[PDB]
Amino acid sequence: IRKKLVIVGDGACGKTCLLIVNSKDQFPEVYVPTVFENYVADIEVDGKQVELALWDTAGQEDYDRLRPLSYPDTDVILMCFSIDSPDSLENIPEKWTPEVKHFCPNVPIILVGNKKDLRNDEHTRRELAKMKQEPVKPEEGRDMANRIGAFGYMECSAKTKDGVREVFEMATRAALQ
């Protein structure tokens, strides 16, 4: 019934907005805190009633120094990149995976691709095209999930709310395990 979630991944990949949406059911359009803190989510996940504490983290450089304090006792990690940022995805196996395996060796990981609303967005496609990039594809996220040993790969959009609910239900399932 009481479970701990930690969410990690590159600066600006949409972690805080994802937690705010899960929690308050509305995307923050103007103000967004660096970290959304102290929130316990009530989740029903079939059978029990879970209280899922949501522990947000950050970088932007020095928030680096505190992040380690987030991992004691976690039950489930959401490890994020954004679908508008091929760069964010390479950081998964390069940075976030070693960091989390180090601090939380056997805790289940859900790999999440955030900003799914941008995958056909015109300005995004233009901006990436100029670098000979394109939005991350679902196949890529699934194979990264495979590679790093994740419990599963999911996509969502905090902006439209599509897929958010399912992220937290699967994380809750994972944490119960």
Ligand X SMILES: Nc1nc2c(ncn2[C@@H]2O[C@H](COP(=O)(O)OP(=O)(O)O)[C@@H](O)[C@H]2O)c(=O)[nH]1
Q: What's the token pair of residue 67?
A: 């992040």
Which one of Mg ion, ligand X, none interacts with residue 22, CB within 5 to 8 A by kind? none
In whole angstroms, give the CA distance from residue 51 to residue 14.
23
23 sits in which H/E element = helix 15-24
In whole angstroms, give the CA distance from residue 115 to residue 60.
19
Rounded least distance, CB 177 to ligand X, Å:
26
Q: Which residues ranging from 95 to 124 are in contact with Mg ion (CB under 5 A)? A: none
Kindly state the number of chain residues that form the binding site for ligand X, as judged by CB under 6 A. 15
- Smaller CB distance to Mg ion: residue 16 or 124? 16
Kindly state whether residue 119 participates in binding ligand X, applying the rule CB under 6 A: no
Report the residue from 4, 119, 159, 173 that binds ligand X according to the rule CB under 6 A: 159
Kindly state whether residue 115 participates in binding ligand X, applying the rule CB under 6 A: yes
DSSP 3-state of 44: strand
CB 157 within 8 A of CB 174: no
φ/ψ of residue 36, rounded to 5: -95, 110
Per CB under 5 A, residues contacting Mg ion are: 16
Question: Which residues would be at the binding site for ligand X (CB under 6 A)?
Answer: 11-17, 32, 114-115, 117-118, 157-159
